[PDB]
Structure formats: structure tokens, C-alpha cells
């Protein structure tokens, strides 16, 4: 229902920056302007968050659905 506390694959704690990432991503998408928002590159944002260049961690960070955005 939220971004997981740790990455499902390797256990890196992406949940430390889950909330900061969500709100910073909403902000960064807003200045960059449903599908065109998803194609905005978040490499720099996630790197500035401190998360490493790990396929699993960025995958689970950017793809996890937020229940609050749907309910």
C-alpha cells in the first residue's frame, strides 16, 4: 500500500527516503510539465536522495503504487 520499508530484492532501506521521494517527485514532475509524467527521468532525484544505482532499489522506489493515491 506504500513504498516498501526495504527493497524487496536486496533489503536496502528505500523506505527511509520513500516519503521525500514521493513529494519531491510530485514537485519535480510539476515543474517538468499521466503517461508523459511517467517518462520523466528520476535518476538525478533518486541519486540526490542517496539511493545507489541499483536496478532493484530504483525499480521498487519508482514503481510501487501508493494506496493513498488510489483510495
Amino acid at each position: 500500500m506504500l513504498i516498501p520499508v526495504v527493497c524487496f530484492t536486496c533489503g536496502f532501506p528505500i523506505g527511509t527516503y520513500a516519503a521525500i521521494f514521493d513529494k519531491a517527485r510530485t514537485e519535480y514532475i510539476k515543474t517538468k510539465m499521466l503517461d508523459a509524467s511517467l517518462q520523466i527521468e528520476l535518476k538525478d532525484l533518486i541519486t540526490a536522495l542517496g539511493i545507489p544505482m541499483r536496478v532493484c532499489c530504483r525499480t521498487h522506489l519508482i514503481t510501487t503504487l501508493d494506496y493513498r493515491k488510489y483510495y
Binding site: F8, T9, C10, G11, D35, L38, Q39, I40, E41, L42, K43, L45, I46, M53, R54, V55, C56, R58, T59, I62, T63
Partner: protein, 148 residues
Amino acid sequence: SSRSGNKGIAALALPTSDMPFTEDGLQPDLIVNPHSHPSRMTNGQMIETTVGLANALQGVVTDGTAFLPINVQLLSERLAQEGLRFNGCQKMFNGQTGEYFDAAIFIGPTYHQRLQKFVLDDRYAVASYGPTDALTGQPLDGKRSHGG
């Protein structure tokens, strides 16, 4: 199952130290046999893994809708431009021994689905006693009737 129709039953669960890992520490959630592909022709899953490898590095979510233009050569070159190999393969080490495989292993994010078929629901074991039919005197039918 994957979104390309490749069903699978979870046969083995390994701890994090027993699972194979790439040189940069990436390890799988699922290990899928390559023999599931050649007869089933589920190239969409393979292409989706190749595309999602670069999507995860770029931090994007792209469209893989059917009949959209696709160029697997350009997707592989995109993998190369992202800093990976032309194929999505990487140097992998065996988690149990620590020895690298001689072959680079294709590893990447493939969207997988958990089909609602639970072994805890499907499994059944009955002993020598239980409810029997009044007419035939045989056991009742199946798990629902608590004998069969």
C-alpha cells in the same frame, strides 16, 4: 506467472546468501529456467526485461503496449548506452560457493504476478476415517466434505 503467460510454481526458496549475485550485487527475486522460453516463444517477457533494465537505471516507466513500434536492436543499444552490456547479461557469482559463472547471466526486472492458486488451499490429506455416504457406504467427496 509473468505477463507473457509463463506459469510457474515456487519450488525452492533460498536465503539471501544462497542466491546468485551480479558483480555489482544485484540478485534475483525469482530464478526462471531458460528452457521455459524456446518452445513457448514468450519473447515479450524477454524484451520487457531488456527494456526494464534500462528503465530502472533511467528511473522511467515506459509503454510496452502491443503493436507499438519495437526495435530490439535499439533497445539493446539503449542498454549499452545505460552502461550495461548490449545484452542485459552480467557477470554473476554463485551465492553458495562464491564462484563466478563462466557465462554472463541475463538478469533484470520482469513484472510477475502471483496467481491465486494457494498450495495451502489445494493440499489435502485424509486419514482412514470420516464421513461416509449413507447409500454406498463410501467416503464423501473431497476436501469440502471432510473426506474423500
